[PDB]
Ligand binder design. Structure first.
Ligand SMILES: [Mg+2]
Ligand SMILES: [Mg+2]
Ligand SMILES: [Mg+2]
Ligand SMILES: [Mg+2]
Ligand SMILES: [Mg+2]
Ligand SMILES: [Mg+2]
Ligand SMILES: [Mg+2]
Ligand SMILES: [Mg+2]
Ligand SMILES: [Mg+2]
Ligand SMILES: [Mg+2]
Ligand SMILES: [Mg+2]
Ligand SMILES: [Mg+2]
Ligand SMILES: [Mg+2]
Ligand SMILES: [Mg+2]
Ligand SMILES: [Mg+2]
Ligand SMILES: [Mg+2]
Ligand SMILES: [Mg+2]
Ligand SMILES: [Mg+2]
Ligand SMILES: [Mg+2]
Ligand SMILES: [Mg+2]
Ligand SMILES: [Mg+2]
Ligand SMILES: [Mg+2]
Ligand SMILES: [Mg+2]
Ligand SMILES: [Mg+2]
Ligand SMILES: [Mg+2]
Ligand SMILES: [Mg+2]
Ligand SMILES: [Mg+2]
Ligand SMILES: [Mg+2]
Ligand SMILES: [Mg+2]
Ligand SMILES: [Mg+2]
Ligand SMILES: [Mg+2]
Ligand SMILES: [Mg+2]
Ligand SMILES: [Mg+2]
Ligand SMILES: [Mg+2]
Ligand SMILES: [Mg+2]
Ligand SMILES: [Mg+2]
Ligand SMILES: [Mg+2]
Ligand SMILES: [Mg+2]
Ligand SMILES: [Mg+2]
Ligand SMILES: [Mg+2]
Ligand SMILES: [Mg+2]
Ligand SMILES: [Mg+2]
Ligand SMILES: [Mg+2]
Ligand SMILES: [Mg+2]
Ligand SMILES: [Mg+2]
Ligand SMILES: [Mg+2]
Ligand SMILES: [Mg+2]
Ligand SMILES: [Mg+2]
Ligand SMILES: [Mg+2]
Ligand SMILES: [Mg+2]
Ligand SMILES: [Mg+2]
Ligand SMILES: [Mg+2]
Ligand SMILES: [Mg+2]
Ligand SMILES: [Mg+2]
Ligand SMILES: [Mg+2]
Ligand SMILES: [Mg+2]
Ligand SMILES: [Mg+2]
Ligand SMILES: [Mg+2]
Ligand SMILES: [Mg+2]
Ligand SMILES: [Mg+2]
Ligand SMILES: [Mg+2]
Ligand SMILES: [Mg+2]
Ligand SMILES: [Mg+2]
Ligand SMILES: [Mg+2]
Lengths: 121, 46, 393, 240, 339
RNA sequence: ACCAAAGCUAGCUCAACAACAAAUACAAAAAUACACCAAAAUAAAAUAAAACAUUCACCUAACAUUAAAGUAUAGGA
RNA sequence: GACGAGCUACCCAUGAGCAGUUUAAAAGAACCAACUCAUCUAUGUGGCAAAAUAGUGAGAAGACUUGUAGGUAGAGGUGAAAA
RNA sequence: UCGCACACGCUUACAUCAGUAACUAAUAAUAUACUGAUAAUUAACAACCAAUAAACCAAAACAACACUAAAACGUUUAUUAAUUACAUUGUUAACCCAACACAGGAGUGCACCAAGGAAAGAUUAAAAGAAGUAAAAGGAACUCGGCAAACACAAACCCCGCCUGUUUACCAAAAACAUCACCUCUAGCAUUACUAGUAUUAGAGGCAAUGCCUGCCCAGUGACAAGUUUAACGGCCGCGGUACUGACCGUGCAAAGGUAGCAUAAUCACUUGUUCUCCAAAUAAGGACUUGUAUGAAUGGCCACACGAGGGUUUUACUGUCUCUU
RNA sequence: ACUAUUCCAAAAGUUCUUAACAUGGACUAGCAAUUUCGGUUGGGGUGACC
């Protein structure tokens, strides 16, 4: 008997199989042969690094900065505000359709939706 | 004949009798879980 | 009417609906709001669930009537594994045929020819028996599923060795597991043999009809036996969706178009798993009949006529220890009537190859009484076997 | 805790079906009935006790069927016959001399003139003669037969009253039924079942039977030879 | 005791060099020296055999209808196996009319070839037996698609003392890194037939390649040369066992060595592509004991991989190579020397 | 002379006032497939009565506090 | 009032073993291994051991041994009754 | 000479290099078990790994064919089954359950060595104790008893069980229990037991096969339906007179008055009953006799086969049990 | 308490009937529950006595 130690695939019988938490890539086949779905395998999207200047570290005498965490409002000001005052001043403002400023009424259309959060990272 | 060897270890048996699942399946077992939480046991159950 | 369910098993009936569904105009407040069960809340009812897009695997099986090929006419299917109650009798009535005891005499004279035997016959056949029954397996006592096809194929190989003396035998090609679909009408009842037999030997050249016209005309007089209490249909599989088309395992213009010999193996270990030697005979009669009707409607067509050029097929069938030989001459494409001229079937049944075998020396009172090997050998059975192989040349 | 009965299958089949035997336990795991356990492994054959059972509801009339084979059954004392007709096979309980390659009649039809019974003949009682030997007898018409199934036993039709049969069960208790009900005419198979002798305790265990207890008791008041006048007659006739 | 199961068909990186290491085999590209001693036999019809071969190919890939498969992936394993069998079966009668040896023969259909042998040495790393010395053991369990069995031995391709500049590759590793696994169970030496059989000698074999080892799968895996090697490896295994069995069956073993070199042939097949092999076994002693001073080696000659046909379309076979048929006939025409 | 010995802190007592994140009920910590869910029935006895049978305060509830009062009453009285 | 049938009693599924010899016989038959029990003696008695060791013994195709996995719970279970 | 592997179960105890004054080893030496650092078992073996209809009555036992207890195991036809390199997971050990680095408990496949292993830290050669070998003459004279031991390993007769089986794990393996058989009672019937059964069946018990039998008693107490039952609980006699005994007679009392057997018994006491056999001698053993006033008939009586690690007695043979020890 | 019995009531009906459930109140058993088993005594018991 061991109470304290955690339960792993290594402790049990033959029949006990528990993955260590790697993610499942497929389903079982007809013949019993195992089937992978090309769309369940995470595909890393990597830019070409050669062309650009950036480094893992920074110069020491290079300055830090005044620390401003990004707020919803700041964002609204940088993006939405200028166009908004532009078209209310023109008087062409339409409170009905805000889509020209970048607002999205509901998220199910687009690829990566924020609230149900479709994407890993 | 000679005694004291009584416990023949089986994992399927260990977890089927004292397993977390099995406790939850019964009101009484829940009471157990609780009683153990209230005493702050490291191990709630197998 | 004692019913066959047990209430204790039958899937539990719905819990009687909470009484707040008994009140007209009233809104039962349910836990559907919390998406999990709660006590104290009335229980919700839910729409039959419709995942608007249908996943192929997880969906509720298509109800059977829905199918395009579905027909309302009851069709009795016969396939590889169907068991007939009265084997040869039923077989014949379905087939509108008459059986004769011996093989055709042509094949006989083939068999008995001093010329057509191998180099050392008994040596070779005994060695094929011993190999298949013992020598081919790692373990002492091999099972039937291995050794049966081994013996049949070893026979086939001893006969393939004759191509040197009789080089007309290059005209043949073997085929495994062949879709065969044969649909015909017999006396208001629709019968289709549909499925795969084990092994087909196809010939490039058709087979010469073995019945003299006297046989044909005398067959016209024969009264079919009737088994009253039993419908002729018993032992078949009723079906509401089928295709009526005449198919043999091949497309148009096949280089070895003409079915020659069919090979039916009984490979099972359990007794009741195999066929009784009678039902076997039936099964291969119907199937041989199929192989025949296929070509019949290929070279001539669906029209119901009596044949000016009689079809002939063969079948062998096996325990691996016991054989059934059969030759089938198709004479008629109209079977709806019972009263016409009938096809002919020769059947040599229950031809014992060897009596019994011993893989271990059988020992009594510290002596070896019986050595290992076969008890009894019938060169007769093989003679006929080779014979059926050799019939084209 | 809970257990499920093996007895769940809906389709009639002739093919022998595997079953889990329970020595003496109820669905709880308690022991209801002592003494049972450790039989030999047994398959169960599905027995049609409703002898007149029209195959297709389209053609209603009186049957004939054929005896294909007669086999030993583990479940009952009786020998069973595998009988087929039309497109169906069914096991029914075999009368004493029923043998393979045979013809057996079923009829629900009641004629005035009665009839001459072969053994395997299944008939409405009221259409039988008044001294016949009967078995596999049904209680209420359409129900399926319950009474008189055991090996070597047979009942007897006594008289016919008011469109109702009176018969005599093997306990020698008499039973009052509608005449409309089906019974088979004869005695059940294997009539020497009585005289079989279990040779050794073993055979008794082979039957699935565990020893009596070893607790010694005194015989209570209930013991003795009791002499009772016969119990009155069972009437399944429901009065208007 | 404990042994390594050596599979013929393998996903291992370079199996060839490894199996040479095991078996004491030396690999020679190109077919064995042509035995110019041939009599003027080749009266053979290449049109009749083009006919015969494409009969099978077409029955399989076109005419013959199977109960419809939902995959549509048209498994090359279930596709080729019947073509292969029916091909050997067909060709046998035909070429045997010229070469009667094959009339007396028995054709083996998917049946096991087993072999068991000792090689090399080990100081055992772990266990309570740690530090002790143990022989390394291997067992080949094989199930060739077809074999051919005869009542007399086939002629040696070179003498028994014949030597080559090329030396057997010594891998620096334990075989586990291949990967290889130790699993012990009954050790069988088997030819496909028990010792009692009148046919003690193998002619050729036919190995259909399993699905894992398809070409396409290999090029998907970023595997290039492997396509060739997969073939190689297989031969060097099966053939070896095939030969060894025979030797063992004749009473030879690691301490009796061998008097007369043993030879068999093999044909390895992806349903489209072929390769042709010859094994001449010389040394049966791979036991370090007999091995220390032992000069001789075991040899396999083999064919570069190669297609039969190209792209069957609508009952026609477009691409075709007689070369294939020619070496096939070569093999199938091989004879026991006569006295 | 060994073994030993001494420290005053850790906290306690009584009383007033009023690290995400993943994963977790498959054999918990295992992303992913077709169902079912859920439920309640007086507290008892030890003990007092010198035994034990009716009865035996507190033991559930809130209601406090100073009295009326150990009174009216209830009790194998 | 919880907790226990991984020991043991009894089932329920589900696997597995029984060589040789004698026998017309796989017959709760004989002989005798593995296996299973535990007769009789001697050791042992804070033991090697909270019931063992050595000899010696009965059974050994059966009401036989045994694996894994379920089942019955104390006012009860289970029992070829020894509370 | 208990070896290799697997399952189960154990968890790093395995591997390499370095350390050990002390801690583990019940001592040391050194290291599979103490310490530290660093590594490590790689999938083809194994786990994961489809449904719904439909035909199929027909055992495994080298399976020819049968036996009775009636026996697990899947083929094919049809309907749909995400189609696509590589999924995930177990792979070390000298190991586990007994508080121990325990003479014990531990399933399967192969082997009897090709594998594994050491009974003795060093001497001495007292007593006593343990285990073993041998012993003159004698051969059970020992002793509760031939227990143990033996160059023996044979016969016989009894009581009790009929038999193979089971029982008090750890003081009882039996004459207890069970059991084939025989017998009573209770049951006329349907979806979870009994039972997918139906009175030749199924339950509550009794007594123990076979063979011969099983006598009389319903008043009491039950039990059943006032009446009936003992193969239900339970019972089954006096007191005098007569040819030492009493067939016969008187009279009373009971529901009936104990029969057939059997008998000093595994049967209160008397009691080492009387006599015959066995022995030189027997409170033993067997045979008879027998009122046992307390035997006795399914709470079973009586013989009898086979059987018994049951309990007694004889003989053969054998011996260190013993003379009497060495 | 419970399991069966038998009954009056209650409920539904007929002008006195009862199918399964089923309540109150009785009865008869089975299965059972709570509790006790006095003192003296030339030790206790039996006797005798209080
Ligand atoms: Mg613990
Ligand atoms: Mg595990
Ligand atoms: Mg494990
Ligand atoms: Mg393991
Ligand atoms: Mg413990
Ligand atoms: Mg155990
Ligand atoms: Mg039964
Ligand atoms: Mg009984
Ligand atoms: Mg009893
Ligand atoms: Mg947590
Ligand atoms: Mg009390
Ligand atoms: Mg008190
Ligand atoms: Mg007190
Ligand atoms: Mg109280
Ligand atoms: Mg258990
Ligand atoms: Mg045996
Ligand atoms: Mg025996
Ligand atoms: Mg001794
Ligand atoms: Mg013995
Ligand atoms: Mg014996
Ligand atoms: Mg359990
Ligand atoms: Mg519990
Ligand atoms: Mg028991
Ligand atoms: Mg007792
Ligand atoms: Mg007692
Ligand atoms: Mg541990
Ligand atoms: Mg130390
Ligand atoms: Mg290992
Ligand atoms: Mg010492
Ligand atoms: Mg001494
Ligand atoms: Mg001594
Ligand atoms: Mg002496
Ligand atoms: Mg004496
Ligand atoms: Mg004395
Ligand atoms: Mg004496
Ligand atoms: Mg003795
Ligand atoms: Mg001695
Ligand atoms: Mg005595
Ligand atoms: Mg006994
Ligand atoms: Mg026995
Ligand atoms: Mg004891
Ligand atoms: Mg015991
Ligand atoms: Mg004892
Ligand atoms: Mg008796
Ligand atoms: Mg007894
Ligand atoms: Mg009375
Ligand atoms: Mg007398
Ligand atoms: Mg007498
Ligand atoms: Mg006495
Ligand atoms: Mg008496
Ligand atoms: Mg009596
Ligand atoms: Mg009595
Ligand atoms: Mg008694
Ligand atoms: Mg008595
Ligand atoms: Mg006897
Ligand atoms: Mg004895
Ligand atoms: Mg005994
Ligand atoms: Mg015994
Ligand atoms: Mg009280
Ligand atoms: Mg007193
Ligand atoms: Mg007193
Ligand atoms: Mg006194
Ligand atoms: Mg005194
Ligand atoms: Mg007194």
């Amino acid at each position: 008997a061991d109470r304290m130690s955690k339960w792993t695939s290594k402790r049990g019988p033959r029949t006990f199989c528990k993955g260590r938490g790697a993610k499942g890539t497929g389903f079982h086949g007809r013949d019993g042969k195992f089937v992978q779905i090309k769309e369940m395998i995470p595909e890393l999207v990597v830019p070409e690094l050669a062309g650009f200047k950036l480094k893992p570290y920074v110069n020491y005498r290079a300055p830090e900065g005044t620390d401003t965490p990004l707020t919803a409002k700041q964002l609204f000001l940088e993006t939405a505000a200028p166009a908004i005052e532009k078209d209310f001043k023109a008087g062409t403002f339409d409170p009905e359709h805000l889509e020209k400023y970048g607002f999205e009424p509901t998220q199910e259309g687009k690829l990566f939706q924020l609230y149900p959060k479709n994407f890993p990272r | 004949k000679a005694r004291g060897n009584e416990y023949q270890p089986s994992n399927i048996k260990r977890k089927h009798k004292h397993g977390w699942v099995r406790r939850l399946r019964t009101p009484t077992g829940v009471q157990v879980i609780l009683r153990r939480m209230h005493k702050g046991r490291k191990s709630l159950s197998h | 009417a004692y019913e066959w369910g047990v209430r204790s098993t039958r899937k539990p009936e719905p819990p009687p609906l909470d009484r707040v569904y008994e009140i007209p105009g009233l809104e039962p407040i349910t836990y559907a709001g919390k998406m999990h069960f709660m006590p104290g809340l009335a229980r919700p009812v839910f729409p039959p669930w419709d995942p608007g897009w249908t996943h192929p695997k997880f969906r509720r099986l298509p109800p059977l009537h829905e199918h395009p090929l579905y027909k309302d006419q009851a069709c009795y299917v016969f396939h590889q594994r169907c068991r007939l109650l009265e084997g040869v009798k039923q077989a014949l009535w379905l087939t509108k045929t008459q059986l004769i005891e011996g093989l055709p005499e042509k094949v006989l004279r083939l068999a008995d020819d001093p010329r057509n035997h191998i180099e050392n016959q008994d040596e070779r056949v005994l060695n094929a028996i011993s190999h298949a029954r013992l020598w081919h397996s790692t373990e002492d006592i091999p099972k039937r599923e291995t050794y049966c096809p081994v013996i049949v194929d070893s026979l086939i190989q001893l006969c393939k060795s004759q191509i040197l003396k009789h080089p007309s035998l290059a005209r043949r090609i073997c085929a495994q597991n062949n879709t065969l679909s044969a649909t015909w009408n017999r006396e208001s009842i629709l019968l289709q043999v549909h499925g795969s037999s084990g092994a087909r030997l196809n010939a490039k050249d058709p087979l010469p009809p073995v019945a003299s016209q006297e046989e044909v005309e005398a067959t016209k007089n024969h009264v079919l036996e009737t088994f009253y209490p039993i419908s002729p249909t018993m032992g078949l599989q009723e079906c509401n969706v089928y295709d009526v088309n005449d198919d043999t395992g091949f497309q148009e213009g096949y280089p070895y178009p003409c079915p020659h010999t069919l090979y039916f193996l009984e490979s099972a270990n359990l007794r009741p798993r195999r066929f009784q030697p009678d039902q076997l005979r039936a099964k291969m009669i119907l199937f041989a009949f199929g192989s025949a009707l296929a070509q019949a409607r290929l070279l001539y067509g669906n029209d119901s006529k009596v044949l000016e050029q009689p079809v002939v097929v063969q079948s062998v069938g096996t325990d691996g220890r016991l054989f059934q030989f059969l030759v089938l001459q198709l004479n008629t494409t109209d079977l709806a009537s019972d009263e016409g001229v009938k096809n002919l079937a020769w059947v040599d049944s229950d031809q014992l190859l060897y009596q019994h075998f011993w893989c271990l020396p059988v020992i009594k009172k510290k002596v070896v009484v019986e050595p290992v090997g076969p008890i009894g050998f019938q060169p007769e059975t093989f003679r006929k076997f080779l014979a059926l192989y050799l019939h084209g040349a | 805790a809970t257990s499920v009965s093996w007895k769940s299958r809906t389709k009639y089949t002739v093919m022998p079906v595997k079953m889990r035997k329970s020595g003496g336990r109820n669905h709880t795991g308690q022991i209801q009935v002592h003494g049972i356990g450790g039989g030999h492994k047994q398959r169960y054959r599905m027995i049609d006790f409703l002898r007149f059972r029209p195959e297709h509801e389209s053609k209603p009339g009186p049957f004939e069927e054929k005896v294909i084979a007669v086999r030993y059954d583990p479940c009952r004392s009786a020998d069973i016959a595998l009988v087929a007709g039309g497109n169906r096979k069914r096991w029914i309980i075999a009368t004493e001399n029923m043998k393979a390659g045979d013809t057996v009649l079923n009829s629900d039809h009641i004629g005035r003139m009665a009839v001459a019974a072969r053994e395997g003949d299944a008939h409405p009682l009221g259409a039988l003669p008044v001294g016949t030997l009967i078995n596999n007898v049904e209680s209420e018409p359409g129900r399926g037969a319950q009474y008189i199934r055991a090996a070597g036993t047979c009942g007897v039709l006594l008289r016919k009253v008011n469109g109702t049969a009176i018969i005599q069960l093997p306990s020698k208790r008499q039973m009052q039924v509608l005449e409309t009900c089906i019974a088979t005419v004869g005695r059940v198979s294997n009539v020497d079942h009585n005289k079989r002798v279990i040779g050794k305790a073993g055979r008794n265990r082979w039957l699935g039977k565990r020893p009596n207890s070893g607790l010694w008791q005194r015989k209570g008041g209930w013991a003795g030879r009791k002499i009772r006048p016969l119990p009155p007659m069972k009437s399944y006739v429901k009065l208007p | 005791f404990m042994k390594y199961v050596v599979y013929p068909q393998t996903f291992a990186l370079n199996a060839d060099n490894w199996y040479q290491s095991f078996t004491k085999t030396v690999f020679l590209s190109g077919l064995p020296p042509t035995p110019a001693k041939l009599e003027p036999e080749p009266t053979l019809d290449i049109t009749a055999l083009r006919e015969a071969v494409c009969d099978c190919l077409l029955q399989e890939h076109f005419f013959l209808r199977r109960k419809k498969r939902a995959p549509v992936i048209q498994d090359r394993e279930a596709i080729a196996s019947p073509f292969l069998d029916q091909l050997v079966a067909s060709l046998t009668g035909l070429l045997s009319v010229h070469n009667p040896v094959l009339a007396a023969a028995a054709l083996d259909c998917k049946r096991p070839v087993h072999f068991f042998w000792l090689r090399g040495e080990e100081i055992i790393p772990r266990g309570h037996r740690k530090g002790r010395v143990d022989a390394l053991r291997y067992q080949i369990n094989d199930k060739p698609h077809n074999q051919i069995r005869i009542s007399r031995q086939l002629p040696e391709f070179v003498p028994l003392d014949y030597s080559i500049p090329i030396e057997v590759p010594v891998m620096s590793c334990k075989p586990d890194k291949l990967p290889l696994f130790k699993r012990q169970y009954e050790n069988t030496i088997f030819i496909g037939s028990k010792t009692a059989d009148p046919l003690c000698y193998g002619h050729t074999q036919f190995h259909l390649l399993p699905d894992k080892l398809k070409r396409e799968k290999l090029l998907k895996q970023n595997c290039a040369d492997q396509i060739e090697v997969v073939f190689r490896a297989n031969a060097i295994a099966s053939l070896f066992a095939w030969t060894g069995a025979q030797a063992m069956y004749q009473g030879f073993w690691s301490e009796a060595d061998v008097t007369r070199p043993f030879v068999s042939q093999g044909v390895i097949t992806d349903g489209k592509y072929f390769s042709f092999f010859c094994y001449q076994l010389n040394t049966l002693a791979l036991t370090a004991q007999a091995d220390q001073n032992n000069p001789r080696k075991n040899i396999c000659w083999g064919t570069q991989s190669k297609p039969l046909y190209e792209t069957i379309e609508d009952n026609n076979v477009k691409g075709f190579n007689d070369d294939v048929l020619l070496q096939l006939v070569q093999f199938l025409l091989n004879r026991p020397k006569e006295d």
